[PDB]
Amino acid sequence: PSWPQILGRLTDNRDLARGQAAWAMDQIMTGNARPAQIAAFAVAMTMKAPTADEVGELAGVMLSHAHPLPADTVPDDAVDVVGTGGDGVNTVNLSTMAAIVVAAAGVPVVKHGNRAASSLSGGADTLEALGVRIDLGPDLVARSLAEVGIGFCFAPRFHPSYRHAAAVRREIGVPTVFNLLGPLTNPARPRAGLIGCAFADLAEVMAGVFAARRSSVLVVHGDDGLDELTTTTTSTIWRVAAGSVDKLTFDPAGFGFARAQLDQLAGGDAQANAAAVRAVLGGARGPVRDAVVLNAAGAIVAHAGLSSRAEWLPAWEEGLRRASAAIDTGAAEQLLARWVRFGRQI
């Protein structure tokens, strides 16, 4: 294997041979690839049209190098709620708020996240401004999970060897296949998730990766471009279950949600976004709450999918009940307070 061989194949517009994507990603992760090689690979792979086998190879290599959580500290039914980012909107941190509510409903959550790349505040930025410790290592994330019901795996802490790819990602600024890897490389390897993808023609490939892993996942793209289930219009859902994918259109109005306008979901810096989380968890009614509940419900449906029994329309109704209730009872607000406290008691 070599860069000339692998890059030549992608520029010739051919799928890679088995193991070639893995070889390249491993070269990148061990500090053996030049920035020019990283960049050419990321770009060539994107314009060829990456396959699920290829992206799955990249994610596998990352996960090989990642710091794992201690043996037996992650429940079999843990869920993630996370997206690619890069939708270019300023939204409040919808995946993060949704994650808190899901954990409050009693579904164990191990969230993978990161600071903003192009938006004003990312999930990690907002959690830090809420006073949550984003910087915890594996042992402490396990304890957070067990003690609070939610853990946060901060991407740079668990994937230090991604530094070179990350620098290339920043320098080129254009989204590539690398922008898919975050939701695919949660170091705790939870088996279910609500997974947002900003790139309409890469979502199916993401779903394919999860299918191969036999995860129960909803990969979601809002038809307004949000890497979240949206309230402004319909969303496309790639439903992953029993190792297979099917594409659905999802209509929040079908459940009773008023249509919102994207400016109603608008964000600010980390201080503003933190105040939006507090408002939502404090019971403020309106568009932010609606989108949070929808997205929490979606994650609860992915969790339910870890069973044969799981049935689409009933799963949603129950997910929506549970998400609403976790906020209404104050369970979500109290969980956030307990999470903040946990991090202060070292």
Ligand X SMILES: O=P(O)(O)OC[C@H]1O[C@H](OP(=O)(O)OP(=O)(O)O)[C@H](O)[C@@H]1O
Ligand Y SMILES: O=C(O)c1ccccc1Cc1ccccc1
Contacts with ligand X by CB under 6 A lie at: 82-83, 85-87, 93-96, 113-114, 116-119, 122-124, 182, 196, 228
The Cα–Cα gap between 239 and 245 comes to: 6
Sign of the C-alpha dihedral computed for residues 197, 234, 80 and 16 taken in this order: negative
Indicate the residue among 43 and 180 with the shorter CB distance to a second copy: 43
Indicate the residue among 119 and 231 with the shorter CB distance to ligand X: 119
Indicate the residue among 180 and 304 with the shorter CB distance to ligand Y: 180
Return the residue nearest ligand X (CB atom).
Answer: 85
* Residue 320 C-beta: closest distance to Mg ion, Å: 19
Q: Which does 40 bind (CB under 5 to 8 A by kind): ligand Y, ligand X, a second copy, none?
A: a second copy
Member of 119, 176, 186, 230 binding a second copy (CB under 8 A): 176
Spatial CB neighbours of 107, under 8 Å, sequence gap ≥ 6? 77, 79, 299, 300, 303
Angle, CA 300 vertex, CA 294 and CA 305 arms, to 5°: 125
CA dist 60 → 10, 57, 133, 174 (Å): 20, 5, 27, 23
Q: Which residue has the tokens 């294997």?
A: 1
Instruction: Mark 42-81 with x for binding to a second copy (rule: CB under 8 A) and - for no binding.
Output: xxx-xxx---------------------------------
228 belongs to an annotated ligand binding site: yes
The Cα–Cα gap between 236 and 145 comes to: 31
Contact 84, 198 (CB under 8 A): yes
Indicate the residue among 60 and 123 with the shorter CB distance to Mg ion: 123
Q: Which does 86 bind (CB under 5 to 8 A by kind): a second copy, ligand Y, ligand X, none?
A: ligand X
3-state secondary structure of 186: coil
* Residue 201 C-beta: closest distance to ligand Y, Å: 17
Indicate the residue among 5 and 307 with the shorter CB distance to a second copy: 5
Q: Which residue has the tokens 């991604």?
A: 162
155 interacts with ligand Y by CB under 6 A? yes
Beta strands 192-196; 109-113: pairing state = unpaired
Q: Which does 162 bind (CB under 5 to 8 A by kind): ligand Y, ligand X, Mg ion, none?
A: ligand Y
116 belongs to an annotated ligand binding site: yes
83 belongs to an annotated ligand binding site: yes
Member of 101, 168, 229, 315 binding a second copy (CB under 8 A): 168
CB atoms within 10 A of CB 65: 17
